[PDB]
Design a protein around this nucleic acid. Structure first.
Ligand SMILES: [Mn+2]
Ligand SMILES: [Mn+2]
Ligand SMILES: [Mn+2]
Ligand SMILES: [Mn+2]
Lengths: 745, 745
DNA sequence: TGAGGTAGTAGGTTGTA
DNA sequence: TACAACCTACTACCTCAT
DNA sequence: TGAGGTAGTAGGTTGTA
DNA sequence: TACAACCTACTACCTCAT
């Protein structure tokens, strides 16, 4: 079989207990809180003493060599107290920061091509390398003609065991940067209006965009009364303007939007934000050619981290601590337990489907009762393309025909739709205003013979004349009319169809049309464990100060959506108030009581993120009702990657592969072939419950594969996944009584 | 006729341009922003120099006498720059702060009873007086046996004119305080668990409540490793524990909830929060006897401020500046323009109603089409009382009978209700859990013959076994069933009815029942101005970090509710995003187009609070559609009171009385007789429009008097008023298509 | 917005106290 | 103030092939 | 939560920059 | 950090009287 591993390198040899110099910090300012200044005190000590190692215990600053007591700082009076040898088993974190400091110090003295510094060391977790190991295993600078510099971005995190053995955890991202700021582009004369930029001089986190390029020079006094050069000279940064030339004073002032008022900045201060979109606007060949360099399968990540670990080498000051340059052959050496979860079985109209593609041959599982009449909006300039699009949709759905002819892939009468073009309507809408899109949706409500909408929207791209998806879905949510939107590009795929490329777009459109009219295309036959309903809690945050309301979804043990609950009030962050948990879980027990006749014996709560709520509330609320419950924290954003080993040959793992240690599990849900990247596994952890962790993993992986809006499964379980989809389609929630019509899908 | 005035005293004589000593502040810290430290620099200079006058211009600190340059502060290096005589017409605010400083300095040397300081001077706007002018015009300390001290709280705000004349604006609140902290109550042995307290030692704004009283002493070392006395000695406040006795070390530690973790505080630090509820729990005779002292009509406020101004007297250092002790006979001397708005006319089934009481004799204006069958929830222990309650409601509504007999007050068949107790239902619910209240509401949905609910809830008071209003209105909003709730006390008023006291409760219940089924009891015949629809915008904030979504209401020019729009996403504070204004005002124009066939020629926007949104967005959006628009900022919370003068005899003004200067108007909407307080007028101001301000005042006062859920009018116009009511009933918004059924009413 | 996944980039919130 | 560990928003590329 | 108004108390947000 | 000018939340008293 295939083993599973993590991006982990063993440390050859051990570190030893060695002498530190423990210091202390007191709050010299008007405050007295040393925890409010502890990290800033460490950083000012570190930078003010030629980058020498300083470490942080709760108030204690440890330091590897005897360094003088710094009273110079205005906020921290660092003073020597005692010198001691810290033991290993009490001080895992301090030895971890020791090892990562010495790895940073060892990597600072490694160069490529004899003159060029290979790494960019800040003595931290993250390590920017200036060169990249390419696909052909050669260290090479990835720069563009326009100077877009690609940089590999490493992330060490060594973990020291109590016996002194160290285990180097790694990852590698990519960094988009450039040596060319705005000033060389203005000397080149490039159009930089409306351009997203950042300042390397201020650490303010705020999205900066250029308004214009004022021909006013920087030596000329601005509307602030003085010039900008003297503005930075007065503000304790005259060293930045000291290295200027007389050519540099001819720089035109570029103004910038700063989300409250326009800031007046010199163009030397500002670097453009380097995204994928910016490369697509500037250097498309570079943006296409690094796509095999940033989306990295596990073999290429292993080769990148192998070159990294070989560039670390032996550290001569930790009892000759060196690292192995290969992964663990099995993660049972880490406490993790490998394994592959059994794939779900899915039921159709005929029985077991082998793919999600076969649901269109075998037939849908649960058609909604009745008959659903279409009604199509389309932009007026795309009438024949839209006609061919709806023709292909209706011939797929009702007549079972693809390219007009009856096909073996598609069974006849998949959904009970009636779209007679002699009877039914093609209301066309002019592209233009948003209020005209809303009135177009009202005019398609104005006739009573429309029960579902296949409205054609303009593209998500093409940032001119306004997109109609958002006004359409707003008005159809206000009127409780379900609707599957299609962009003009997919309508062009349907009208210009010659191969089977449009067929897959028709598969996912028909699954959307089915799920939005309350149909269910497949269900699982059984689900592992003693569960009666799933609850998927998630609290999202769109912007700063805006939190998505705590959208819950309620499933049965067979995965089909019982209910969703959206509280009308927003809340204070990722903590759900206990009145909101009262609303949510009363709605859970009410809906399971209605659809099943009794309370659930077991509830499994899939909280997306951290379940920071009162477990005392849960124990009270479900011990009052004799309900066993479980809380699982399913977490997406994790830099850990699970690689799969076939005798040293690193590869992506199959879906349903997990690693398991205690109450934390990392599980792969997506099958990604190489040259498409690497699967980002889910961080799954139990905050309370009686279930073993493998049962919650089987439930979560079965809840990924029963996503009913695509023919390929979701990365998330659809508890947290559909909670995220409701959080995205939160202004699209339909008005009428909450039911099994998955509007968001 | 009756004039109108404000709480304003003229300053006899003039102030003169006199020599200051202008200073400057630079940002000595790691920052450099002097605006971030300007007020703190003024306060540290003021307190560090025996409370000498310091003033604030943009960065300039002015100071009345030559004071030494203070380099002592760690954040501000105050240094003398120049000494000058500031002219009057440039420096209104600085002379205002001069005059209020010298008023504070003059009042600090005025005492009552020869030994007791009358005022508590912080040299600010607010001035706590220790004694109160009572109703019998005598200065007397209002203290309780339990030491609850009532204190009058003044608020000076003098405004200096360019010629040097000063006009003293005043107000007076009351202060609830006590000299008795927790320690004297614990020496008295009082139960202080669960009690809301504040600390006089820390300025942290956070609602503190006591968890328990730990018998652990303060000298004993706590779980923080040390004792609390040494905790305040280590934290630069050893002077507070220096004046203690050996008896004081026997104080038991009282812990306190601090909204993130329990703080460990000495009982000497903590003072109980003194509310009306706390007086009601402790000293009810004191809480009833000061009710004529805190709710103050305009005559008693005038006598209080008269005694205040006589206690100021002549200030010998401002060219003998003294104040008149009487109000302005007319506010045309202030630029304000007095006037009384014509009362609205209201239409019924027969025509002009003279009161809102006569709508039950003349008949409702617009009954909803169809027939509405009741259905009653009631608590199981109140069955006969509930039976008599619903009997009185139905005999008022359908049969037109009060106390079982046909009355001349009530016309027969007010609403088309059918409540046959042989046919219809009395579902009774056990008092208890919240989920049982929700299942009771579901079981009353479970039968189809219920079209409105008259559910009987337990009281808003009586903080034991749970109130059922919130689960009932949640489930009835989820099921789109309108419902008028009644507390057990009002059911007892109906069952124990002998006088006509229950009749008025029946008036407002039947108006609620009508407005919730989409009926309209009265409309105005015409409304002054060229208006076609009203838009009431309001963004409320319940807690810290939670903002109510920007609830809009759309009316016609005849006041009846066209529409309400609640955006599903919360936002960032009192700024409405332009996408939210797009949603809101497209919904406005859509709903007026649907109900009227065309766009409105004129829109009047009643924004509640500040209209801080882009007026460029409004001009773009309504110049694209050729819609004239107006924005009026209707503001509640205002310390200005409008008094009415009848030849020196100050009194409350009638409703519809306004004062008007430019684009700011204060208008009285509530008729309050004396001994019930004073009317709090509305601050009404136009941020943009073409209408004159008097037309917007007539529209706003007509929009107060057409409140259709009470027989006495609202203080707010029902644009901003119903926006506030939707913001309160925001988790009660019904599911189905938004219409004229005022669920919130 | 066919759907889903990877990838960057930018910015958040919360515990750590 | 500050990082870690989670998030969200957005945009590219890329595939889909019983 | 009959409805509405005054009154406190507590705490917010935003401009002032 | 800080006030001004607006807000919200909560609780008392108080009236309602064609
Ligand atoms: Mn989310
Ligand atoms: Mn979709
Ligand atoms: Mn509000
Ligand atoms: Mn009500």
């Amino acid at each position: 079989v295939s083993n599973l591993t993590v991006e982990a390198f063993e440390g050859i040899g051990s570190v030893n207990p060695m002498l530190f110099y423990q210091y202390k910090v007191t709050g010299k300012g008007k405050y007295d809180n040393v925890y409010k200044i502890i990290k800033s005190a460490r950083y000012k000590m570190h930078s003010k003493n030629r980058f020498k190692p300083v470490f942080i215990k709760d108030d204690k600053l440890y330091t590897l060599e005897k360094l003088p007591d710094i009273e110079d700082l205005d906020f921290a009076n660092i003073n020597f107290v005692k010198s001691e040898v810290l033991s290993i088993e009490d001080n895992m974190s301090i030895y971890g920061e020791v090892v990562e400091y010495y790895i940073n110090l060892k990597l600072k003295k490694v160069k490529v091509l004899g003159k060029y510094p290979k790494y960019r060391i800040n003595y931290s977790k993250e390590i920017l390398s200036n060169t990249l190991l390419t696909r052909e295993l050669k260290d090479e600078f990835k720069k563009s003609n326009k100077g877009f510099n690609l940089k590999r971005k490493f992330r060490i995190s060594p973990v020291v065991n109590k016996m002194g053995k160290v285990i180097l955890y790694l990852s590698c991202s990519a960094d988009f940067s450039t040596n060319k700021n705005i000033y060389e582009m203005l000397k080149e004369g490039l159009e930089v209006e409306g351009l997203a930029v950042k300042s390397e001089w201020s650490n303010i986190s705020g999205n900066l965009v250029i308004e214009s390029v004022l021909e006013t020079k920087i030596s000329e006094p601005t509307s602030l009364g003085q010039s900008l050069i003297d503005y930075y000279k007065n503000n304790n940064q005259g060293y930045r303007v000291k290295d200027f030339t007389d050519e540099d004073l001819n720089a035109n002032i570029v103004n910038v939007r700063g989300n409250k008022k326009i800031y007046m900045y010199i163009p030397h201060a500002l670097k453009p934000i380097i995204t994928r979109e910016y490369l697509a606007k500037n250097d498309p060949e570079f943006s296409k050619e690094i796509e095999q360099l940033i989306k990295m399968n596990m073999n290429y990540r292993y080769e990148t981290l192998k070159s990294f670990v070989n560039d670390i080498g032996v550290i001569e000051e930790l009892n000759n601590l060196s690292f192995k340059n290969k992964y663990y052959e099995d993660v049972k050496l880490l406490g993790y337990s490998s394994g592959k979860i059994d794939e779900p079985v899915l039921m159709g109209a005929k029985g077991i489907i082998k793919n999600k593609m076969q649901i269109f041959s075998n037939g849908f599982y649960k058609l909604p009762e009745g008959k659903v009449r279409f009604g199509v909006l389309y932009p007026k300039e795309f009438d024949g393309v839209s006609r061919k699009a709806i023709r292909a949709i209706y011939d797929f759905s009702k007549e079972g025909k693809y390219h007009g002819e009856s096909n073996k892939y598609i069974a006849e009468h998949l959904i009970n739709v009636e779209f007679n073009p002699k009877e039914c309507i093609f209301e066309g809408y002019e592209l233009g205003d948003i209020t005209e899109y809303k009135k177009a949706a009202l005019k398609l409500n104005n006739y009573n013979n429309v029960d579902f909408v296949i409205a054609i929207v303009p593209n998500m791209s093409d940032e001119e004349i306004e997109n109609s998806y958002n006004p359409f879905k707003k008005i159809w949510a206000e009127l409780n009319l379900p609707s599957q939107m299609i962009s003009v590009k997919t309508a062009e795929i349907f009208a210009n169809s010659r191969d089977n490329t449009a067929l897959y777009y028709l598969h996912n459109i028909v699954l959307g049309i089915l799920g939005k009219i309350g149909g269910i295309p497949w269900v699982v036959k059984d689900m592992k464990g003693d569960v009666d309903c799933f609850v998927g809690l998630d609290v999202g945050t769109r912007e700063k100060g805006i939190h998505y309301p705590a959208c819950s979804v309620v499933f049965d043990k067979y995965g089909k959506l019982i209910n969703y609950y959206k509280p009308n009030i927003p809340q204070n962050g990722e903590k759900i108030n206990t009145e909101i948990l009262q609303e949510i879980f009363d709605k859970v027990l009410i809906s399971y009581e209605e659809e099943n006749g009794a309370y659930p014996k077991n509830i499994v709560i899939h909280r997306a993120g951290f379940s920071r709520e009162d477990l005392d509330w849960y124990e009270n609320y479900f011990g009052k009702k004799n309900i066993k419950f479980n809380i699982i924290e399913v977490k997406k954003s994790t830099p850990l990657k699970i690689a799969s080993i076939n005798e040293g040959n690193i590869t992506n793992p199959e879906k349903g592969s997990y690693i398991l240690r205690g109450n934390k599990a990392y599980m792969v849900t997506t099958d990604i072939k190489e040259n498409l990247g690497s699967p980002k596994p889910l961080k799954i952890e139990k905050s309370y419950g009686d279930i073993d962790m493998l049962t919650a993993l089987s439930q979560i992986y079965a809840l990924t594969q029963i996503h009913v809006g695509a023919t390929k499964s979701l990365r998330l379980p659809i508890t947290t996944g559909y909670a995220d989809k409701i959080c995205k389609a939160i202004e699209f929630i339909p008005q009428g009584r909450v039911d099994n019509r998955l509007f968001f899908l």
